[PDB]
Amino acid sequence: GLVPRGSHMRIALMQHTARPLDPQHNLDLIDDAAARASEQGAQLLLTPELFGFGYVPSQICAQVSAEQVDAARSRLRGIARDRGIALVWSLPGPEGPEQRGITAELADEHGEVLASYQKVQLYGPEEKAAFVPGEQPPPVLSWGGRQLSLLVAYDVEFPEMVRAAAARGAQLVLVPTALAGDETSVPGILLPARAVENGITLAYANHCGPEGGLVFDGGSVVVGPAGQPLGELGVEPGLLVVDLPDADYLQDRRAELHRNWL
Amino acid sequence: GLVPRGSHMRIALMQHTARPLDPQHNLDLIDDAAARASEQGAQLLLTPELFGFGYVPSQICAQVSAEQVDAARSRLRGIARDRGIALVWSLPGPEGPEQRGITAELADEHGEVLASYQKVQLYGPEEKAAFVPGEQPPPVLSWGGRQLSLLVAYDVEFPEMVRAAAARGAQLVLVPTALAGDETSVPGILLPARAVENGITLAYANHCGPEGGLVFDGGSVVVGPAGQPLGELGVEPGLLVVDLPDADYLQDRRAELHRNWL
Numbered sequence: 001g002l003v004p005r006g007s008h009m010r011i012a013l014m015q016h017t018a019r020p021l022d023p024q025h026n027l028d029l030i031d032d033a034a035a036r037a038s039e040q041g042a043q044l045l046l047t048p049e050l051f052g053f054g055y056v057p058s059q060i061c062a063q064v065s066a067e068q069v070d071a072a073r074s075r076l077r078g079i080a081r082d083r084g085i086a087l088v089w090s091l092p093g094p095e096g097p098e099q100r101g102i103t104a105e106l107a108d109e110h111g112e113v114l115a116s117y118q119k120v121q122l123y124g125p126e127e128k129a130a131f132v133p134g135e136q137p138p139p140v141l142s143w144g145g146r147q148l149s150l151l152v153a154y155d156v157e158f159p160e161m162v163r164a165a166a167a168r169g170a171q172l173v174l175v176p177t178a179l180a181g182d183e184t185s186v187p188g189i190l191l192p193a194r195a196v197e198n199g200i201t202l203a204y205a206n207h208c209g210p211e212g213g214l215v216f217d218g219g220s221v222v223v224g225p226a227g228q229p230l231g232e233l234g235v236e237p238g239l240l241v242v243d244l245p246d247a248d249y250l251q252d253r254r255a256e257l258h259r260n261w262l
Numbered sequence: 263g264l265v266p267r268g269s270h271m272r273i274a275l276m277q278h279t280a281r282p283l284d285p286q287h288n289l290d291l292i293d294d295a296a297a298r299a300s301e302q303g304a305q306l307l308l309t310p311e312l313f314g315f316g317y318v319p320s321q322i323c324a325q326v327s328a329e330q331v332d333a334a335r336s337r338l339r340g341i342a343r344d345r346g347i348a349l350v351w352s353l354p355g356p357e358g359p360e361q362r363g364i365t366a367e368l369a370d371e372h373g374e375v376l377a378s379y380q381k382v383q384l385y386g387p388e389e390k391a392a393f394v395p396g397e398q399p400p401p402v403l404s405w406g407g408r409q410l411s412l413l414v415a416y417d418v419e420f421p422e423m424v425r426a427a428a429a430r431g432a433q434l435v436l437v438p439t440a441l442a443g444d445e446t447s448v449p450g451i452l453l454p455a456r457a458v459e460n461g462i463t464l465a466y467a468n469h470c471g472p473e474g475g476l477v478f479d480g481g482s483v484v485v486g487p488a489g490q491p492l493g494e495l496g497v498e499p500g501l502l503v504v505d506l507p508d509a510d511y512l513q514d515r516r517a518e519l520h521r522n523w524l
């Protein structure tokens with residue numbers, strides 16, 4: 001509807017099926033989503049993990065060059081500009097095939113990249129074979145009047161990763177993902193916990209449908225700091241649009257002890 | 263019912279109202295529970311936080327001497343013996359009023375204390391004024407064919423505390439608690455997450471009803487490693503009896519990085 005009294009940030013999440021190794025098609029889909037999100041008055045669009053090339057880690061590593069990643073990145077910056085909306089995307093990193101990870105980046109409505117992050121927790125043997133894990137903590141930055149951060153997919157399943165973002169001041173954690181296999185406890189159990197245990201909002205944007213030998217769950221969701229869904233999708237493609245409203249675990253935690261016990 | 267094929271541990275949880283500063287009454291209640299649990303073939307009974315003196319931290323600190331704590335402890339060891347069942351209880355620690363914390367201890371069916379733990383995360387100003395926080399990680403020990411551990415109440419709300427137990431090999435985490443205020447997201451959201459994110463079982467034993475200026479939630483529960491309740495109580499007093507059946511987060515986690523980011 002209309003932007004409410006008492007909300008100063010409206011976000012959008014893209015849920016859709018990508019075609020493996022067809023970035024012209026996948027980027028066209030993000031362009032359409034960015035246009036529809038901007039038309040609904042969203043200021044930011046979050047898109048799923050590796051969407052541009054499809055979630056096909058072994059085939060990315062074998063077939064997708066650094067020049068082809070750079071061209072998709074350049075076009076995504078163009079979409080943020082031409083559609084006038086901040087965009088979070090996830091591509092392979094910019095290094096060579098054997099040296100790059102899986103990334104997430106935030107570009108503003110001018111097409112400038114404000115923040116970049118390399119996925120720390122790679123999932124399973126195919127990712128671990130195709131990508132190098134990140135070594136840096138998630139970034140946190142002011143945008144639209146809140147502290148935003150980025151994490152990718154499996155990352156958010158580790159309470160430590162979200163705690164790292166929140167400990168640096170994050171209020172809204174944006175998470176491109178690619179979750180298949182009817183893993184209902186991730187959105188159902190883990191994500192609400194991450195939100196509650198840190199007093200933060202998390203946005204989780206998944207693929208859906210048949211893609212790269214898997215069938216993705218959909219279930220994209222924005223979870224508020226009480227653990228409740230501010231909005232959620234089912235299994236079908238969709239554009240989720242949400243207005244964010246305007247125990248103190250982060251202070252009580254004995255971090256110095258905890259760091260020695262992990 | 264009968265002990266099932268495929269289960270070699272049956273546990274019991276006591277949910278009840280304590281009377282503040284009346285350990286003869288409160289220990290009589292634990293004695294009754296221990297008798298009923300043992301009659302149902304349970305090998306261990308878990309009881310709630312500070313049950314013996316009631317959950318009244320400021321009044322414990324002001325009125326309950328080290329000799330009176332020691333006498334209750336001695337009697338609880340007697341109950342484990344006389345009723346022939348392992349018992350987990352939670353009392354003030356054995357030091358002076360100004361030096362003690364909140365503890366949990368496990369005694370075997372012979373009345374010998376196998377493990378002791380001092381609550382690390384104290385909750386709110388009254389606890390923090392009445393008790394000294396623990397400084398040690400949770401203990402983990404073989405008993406009944408599994409690795410058992412202990413945590414207390416608020417502790418379990420910190421993913422780091424349960425991760426510490428699981429990283430030392432815990433399979434079943436036993437948690438005396440005192441949760442009031444209709445805090446449904448603790449049993450509803452956090453506990454299932456703790457179980458899933460570590461692949462462990464957690465038993466959570468609460469007070470219920472009117473006690474010490476609060477009304478306790480009940481909602482005692484045993485949560486399995488899929489995050490599902492193996493058994494649970496509502497708001498009324500009860501004895502919950504459960505048979506325990508016979509992503510690899512603990513291996514994937516980049517603990518060395520995580521320890522620097524908390």
Ligand SMILES: NC(=O)CCCCC(N)=O
Pocket residue numbers: 049122123152153154155157177178179183186509
């Ligand atoms: N792209 C990913 O990180 C997939 C995460 C799957 C995690 C899970 N728990 O099944």
Ligand SMILES: NC(=O)CCCCC(N)=O
Pocket residue numbers: 247311384385414415416417419439440441445448
């Ligand atoms: N005895 C306790 O540790 C009370 C925990 C209350 C925690 C909560 N989240 O409200």
